[PDB]
Design a protein around this ligand. Structure first.
Ligand SMILES: CC[C@H](C)[C@H]1C(=O)N(Cc2ccc(OC)c3ccccc23)C[C@@H]2N(C(=O)NCCCC(F)(F)F)CCC(=O)N12
Ligand SMILES: CC[C@H](C)[C@H]1C(=O)N(Cc2ccc(OC)c3ccccc23)C[C@@H]2N(C(=O)NCCCC(F)(F)F)CCC(=O)N12
Ligand SMILES: CC[C@H](C)[C@H]1C(=O)N(Cc2ccc(OC)c3ccccc23)C[C@@H]2N(C(=O)NCCCC(F)(F)F)CCC(=O)N12
Ligand SMILES: CC[C@H](C)[C@H]1C(=O)N(Cc2ccc(OC)c3ccccc23)C[C@@H]2N(C(=O)NCCCC(F)(F)F)CCC(=O)N12
Ligand SMILES: CC[C@H](C)[C@H]1C(=O)N(Cc2ccc(OC)c3ccccc23)C[C@@H]2N(C(=O)NCCCC(F)(F)F)CCC(=O)N12
Ligand SMILES: CC[C@H](C)[C@H]1C(=O)N(Cc2ccc(OC)c3ccccc23)C[C@@H]2N(C(=O)NCCCC(F)(F)F)CCC(=O)N12
Ligand SMILES: CC[C@H](C)[C@H]1C(=O)N(Cc2ccc(OC)c3ccccc23)C[C@@H]2N(C(=O)NCCCC(F)(F)F)CCC(=O)N12
Ligand SMILES: CC[C@H](C)[C@H]1C(=O)N(Cc2ccc(OC)c3ccccc23)C[C@@H]2N(C(=O)NCCCC(F)(F)F)CCC(=O)N12
Ligand SMILES: CC[C@H](C)[C@H]1C(=O)N(Cc2ccc(OC)c3ccccc23)C[C@@H]2N(C(=O)NCCCC(F)(F)F)CCC(=O)N12
Lengths: 184, 190, 191, 181, 184, 185, 186, 183, 180
């Protein structure tokens, strides 16, 4: 049961202050919702910052790029904050936040790897599927290189296997700008 | 949950997608079945009734689906008076890319990292030889119907469409523009 | 998720789900497989609309693969019973009992959009158990076909003999071929 | 399967040149029958072989393995339908040596068009459709040759399930005699 | 069926009106997203007043737990923790994460601690990556648990090797809570 | 399933909560415990002096979830009356015995059952040992509290809870699980 | 029920006594091992006399097929290939692998040729490896099938893109077999 | 149906001429059988060569090492011949044949990769499983280095992913000695 | 299973070789126990050879094999080929003193016994006491045959402990590593 506040559900109350929740696996439904929220908020105010909360294991690459392109297209800066974890396409979207406004809390987990998929059937069908996922990885690595400041060659090497980063290591890597440390 | 948006009135609450429909935006954000087609067809009929002059905006993030359900949407877009803009965000595959190509001439768009896929229709038949023949003749005629309309809306020949849609053909937004499926790749606002 | 529409009136904002808004302008949706629930709803909508106005036309949207013959005949009989002319429009597809109901619209007011698909075939069914039980089931589905073909003959203008031959297997028709056959009156071309 | 003084019943029948087609026709059944036919040819090229048919048919290719082997070998292969011959089994019943195709009085003979399935792309469905259509043409041409009926008549008579009595099968040309007591 | 109280509040939403958040289930990303959003909502309402985290949980996801942990430490209000029924694993970790001097348990509440659980599959290098990750996760957990209990990291490692059930009184002695809240 | 009553419209159970009646009418899991614990905190905040009425028609369930309800009953100031209607089995009968002194009731044909706690253990011998020591502790914890509230000895409870022990309303009164059999007028 | 013949042989073991091997099922490793072992046994009995490989098979494992293929080529005796019923995929490859001039099909036998089928699942680089493997396997198959049919590699590529069913006579024209085996004289 | 050829089943006849079949996935049942055949054949004759046929996708590493150790323990040379395919522990055993007597037919497929496994439970239990499989890989890679003549660094890198090799490439790599060409 | 007339394992049994090459259940125990009794009846002085390629299994089934090895007069040699784990490693250690072997790459695993218990608290207690006694029984015997203390065996069997053949020899589970 998601609690009510007064009548907003808790997540709708957060959207009132320009906070969007990416708190699940990324499919087309999640992407359609977030994309729509981004369009609504920029229509309300094109100057004020938007805040993208990220607690996600990733998911669909095309659904992820739906969110990515909408972030870049709109005028407002979209801040990103990783709380809990950002894995796979979640960490890609974390790195896609406005330059200087990509954050994570100290114990947040960031993971990067190569895209996952499958193919079955004739040899030429397997080839088409293989060329597709390789082009998709090159596309992902190229953008990640541009937003982190790392070389495409280094991204390729570091995303070959599952690579778990602490929030601080994600800052060192260039996936975020600051680790949001708590007040004593 | 579908997020609720609330705006200060002289406080009115909307579900996000109904609020988008208020500004003439229709969401094609799922696999195309009869239910999705009926909704989109009804929305198109509602918006043209509200205003026959103002543009309609069809958001497309779909893997495609039913060809007949797709043609329900297609024919309704062609029948109504206002221009239907199409924008691919995320992906448009199969019937989804067909509907992307069906948007108003000069108003078919995609964001730079959107994926466009085209291929021949999928189906199945089972039973007697004459039943398989009927099913085969039907899906072949459906492909001719699709390819002929794609040729008209892209400028590509029916022979080239046949060859390019024989297997899965993935296109970038820029390649989709070059192919004639869209008119412009939308680049970021300043 | 059915989208909501918001109309401003002189009393205030009025919210409708999209399909209920269309019902306000006498548009009924047959947009699914025909079962008893779908027939019960459509039959009730027809009775509601004729009570509001017995002269005005009603519009039956048809995007259906067909389904139950008895549920189809619930809709058919209610269309013929009420005073209002029921226009039918095929958008997407009309197959089996869906195409039967497309042909059941008011004379001169049966439509299809250019790329809509119309299919006609003989009814489907099953029988299991004793020889006498299989006989009863076979006689029942055969009389149901004669019933369907007789009414389809009357509404298309085709003979019962020609309808029998043409519905022996799956027979897919274009919107123009459906017009030529007599299943619809006009193809509604775009302006 | 009982033993007889020591042979299993079907191996004893094979000793007297009798082959059992008593099940659905798959590749395993075809491989067995084809091998038995070749074996019986080597034992004696002159003496008749007797193919017992109680079968609902099955695989068309597996059926043609049996068909071609029957027409290839030197000995005449008598066919006898006991119980039923359907589809490919009734095709093989008709494949027996001219004048030596039989059925018992209450045996059931059924003929229909070949059954199959296709799934995937439109061009793949087209290929499967052209395949099964040409397979029917191949079956109907051979059935026309062996029954004496026209290809046009067989096409119409195999459109749906067509059940025949033993006497009707004789009149059709699927068999030569109804074997009385 | 959750009962309602009359504005109409479901019982949990009514408790949120008095700054009480419920952690009453297995910790997954949905529970974390909700609790994190409630913590942000309550500190926005008032940054001085105490928040009260009810804990009846068997634990669950370590990343989802750390989403709640970091959000507790980030916000200005003291987050009190009270164990009613049980707190195990990540739930007992979040119990120890409460404001200093404001971590409670009712007399018959059960507190359990152990090392984190997981799974690994595939190639030898993939298994190595999974093992190094879950070992770093335990070090990360034991470090924080050491600081908040006052026990040595060597002692935490030993006592979390197997399932270790503790009474409310034993949890106070261990440093997981501050007081056993006895009935007046 | 649940009917509405109008006066402000309430579902039947929410209307009962307005008169300080809490329903324990199902298997005791964490969700049921969380709900009841929240209702007890709501009612004591509304009025810390007026009685609360815990309806008990439960087969029991989770011991920790039961102890969530138990500890919340003992902590709050209001008297929590307990009334067994239908049945109170296992942890339900523990909570029936946990009601305010002199205000634990049962209707004449209500069923009260008591037994030892149920559980599981899998894996290594030391893991089984830890699991066995835990549930044995949990039983002592339950038996010690039952002893205090019933007036029966710990060793007597041990023997009487070894197997399933069904009791009538009158036998539950005689045992000390309830105070009165609430007879009809 | 495989019938016995009378020493008591099962029917297939009796056929092996006259140098006939049965490829009458889907090609898996078990079938390949048995056929490879039979081929080694028959060459040891007699290194000159022809072996007969009956083929009624829908194909199967490519590696299992190449176990059979390589053993045929390695041994001294000619392996006649005899298509009865049907030869599809790797079955039709093995049909084409029979001794030159001694590849047969019966008049109504079905021969089908198409590209190899497979699967890939996991990371992008794992999918790439699986794709490169099956593509190289196709080139290997096409190159050999080119050499034995007399058709160009690009013609084989085009004609095996989809399912391609050939009659016995069309298989002879294509070069997959040498003769449509006629009935024996009597 | 295994054909008959006294009357022997085909594989028993091959065993009479000292040919052992490794034609399936390597489990404990297959290893126990092959190990027993090796022990039987060396007892019949310690000097005459044994021939290990390999058409296997591999399987259990321990079951593979059962066969490996028995090959090295016995006096007779165990020839290895890859027909069809040798993958994983199957290709390890192909490389384990007598020096100069490891073969493959021209179109045989050879695959090498790192060992596969699983682990579940506590962090310390996962650690133990990780330490074990890594030791198993080093154990395997060291023997490959010795029998191929390649450096262990090269073996480590080349077995990181699935690495398919032709018969000629297997010869060049050192996994086999000759590609057995047809007469 | 190839033939040589004898099936391969029956031919090995003719030379007093018993195969423990599978998971240990009652059926495997009954077979091996019966082979041990049969081989004693054939010759009470000549050695028996127990091949061990097993992941272990039932402890009572393992103890059926153990007691029968100890009961009979002939020495029972044990050789680990492939792997011996759990009860398989226990039975490996139970072989005749000075005649317990393993090939170089053979794997030896030792760990505490696994079990399960469901129901009432007193039933869980009875199951827990039983498996604990079973561990004491196993550790006491493993102490006698390895030469290690009961405390060290308790420590080293708390978790999965994978040993090489040489490490198993050093531990006392075997006497010699058979070199080629
Ligand atoms: C940059 C937007 C450009 C300017 C353009 C457009 O091309 N679109 C397509 C579009 C649709 C759906 C979308 O994700 C759901 C879009 C996301 C990103 C970009 C375009 C999208 C429709 C858009 N509209 C609006 O935004 N109005 C404001 C009301 C928005 C809201 F949410 F409050 F109702 C209609 C008018 C218009 O011109 N546009
Ligand atoms: C336009 C086509 C012509 C004008 C005609 C018509 O033939 N029809 C059939 C129709 C039904 C359903 C449909 O998709 C659900 C139709 C879609 C496309 C075309 C026809 C469709 C009904 C139509 N109506 C309307 O459009 N009213 C306006 C109110 C619309 C809304 F949505 F707000 F209620 C009723 C009046 C009418 O004459 N028509
Ligand atoms: C022409 C119908 C005739 C006139 C008759 C009748 O025999 N019936 C049966 C009937 C029921 C349900 C039905 O589909 C749900 C019927 C459908 C078709 C015919 C009869 C049906 C009830 C009907 N009523 C009405 O029509 N009220 C008007 C208000 C209707 C609505 F929908 F707005 F509430 C009640 C009064 C009455 O006499 N009738
Ligand atoms: C001159 C006979 C045919 C045409 C010829 C031949 O081409 N083949 C191929 C063949 C194989 C399998 C077959 O169905 C299993 C065949 C079926 C039909 C035709 C050919 C077949 C092998 C055949 N053999 C025999 O017939 N030997 C006799 C022993 C038979 C048996 F069964 F007892 F062992 C070997 C010698 C030989 O020349 N042939
Ligand atoms: C300390 C918050 C910091 C200052 C900052 C921020 O960085 N965020 C990201 C964030 C998002 C989601 C979150 O858990 C759902 C966050 C949790 C913890 C920290 C940041 C989080 C958005 C935040 N906002 C607010 O809090 N406004 C008040 C309204 C809150 C509520 F809930 F009532 F609607 C927007 C303005 C702002 O500056 N911030
Ligand atoms: C009495 C306990 C003490 C006083 C303390 C407290 O420690 N807690 C923790 C607590 C949370 C959840 C609980 O079961 C859901 C608690 C149950 C028992 C004890 C504490 C619990 C919060 C409590 N609050 C209240 O009681 N407000 C009154 C409004 C309650 C309601 F329900 F109407 F909204 C907040 C203020 C406060 O100090 N407390
Ligand atoms: C011809 C190959 C060469 C000659 C060589 C050889 O390299 N091998 C490996 C081999 C094994 C298994 C095989 O398919 C199961 C082989 C298949 C093809 C090639 C080699 C094969 C063993 C072979 N043997 C025999 O052929 N003996 C004759 C007995 C045959 C039979 F079947 F009756 F028992 C042993 C002697 C020998 O030197 N060889
Ligand atoms: C080299 C083995 C050494 C010499 C020794 C030995 O230690 N063992 C253990 C052993 C068992 C099982 C095995 O794989 C099933 C063994 C495999 C490899 C090594 C030992 C094995 C028993 C062996 N025996 C034999 O060799 N018999 C000869 C006949 C065997 C056969 F197969 F023909 F029946 C008994 C005599 C003997 O001393 N040994
Ligand atoms: C040694 C035990 C003593 C000697 C005694 C005995 O008490 N028993 C019980 C027993 C049964 C089964 C067993 O594992 C299947 C036994 C195992 C171990 C001990 C006893 C066992 C039967 C035994 N027998 C034999 O040994 N016969 C010899 C033939 C044996 C074989 F295997 F070849 F057929 C019968 C005669 C006899 O007195 N005994």
């Amino acid at each position: 049961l998601i609690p009510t506040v007064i009548a907003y559900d808790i997540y709708s109350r957060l959207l009132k202050d320009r906070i969007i929740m990416l708190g699940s696996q990324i499919d087309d439904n999640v992407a359609n919702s977030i994309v729509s929220q981004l369009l609504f908020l920029q229509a309300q105010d094109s100057e004020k910052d938007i805040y993208l909360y990220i607690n996600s294991p990733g998911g669909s690459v095309t659904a992820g790029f739906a969110i990515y392109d909408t972030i870049q297209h709109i005028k407002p800066d979209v801040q990103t904050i990783c709380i809990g974890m950002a894995a796979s396409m979640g960490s890609f979207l974390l790195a896609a936040g406005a330059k200087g406004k990509r954050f994570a809390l100290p114990n947040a987990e960031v993971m990067i790897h190569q895209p996952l998929g499958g193919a079955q059937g004739q040899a030429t069908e397997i080839e088409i599927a293989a060329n597709h996922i390789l082009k998709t990885r090159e596309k992902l690595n190229r953008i990640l290189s541009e937003r982190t400041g790392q070389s495409i060659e280094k991204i390729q090497k570091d995303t070959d296997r599952d690579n778990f980063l602490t929030a601080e290591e994600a800052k060192e890597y260039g996936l975020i700008d600051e680790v949001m440390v708590p007040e004593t």
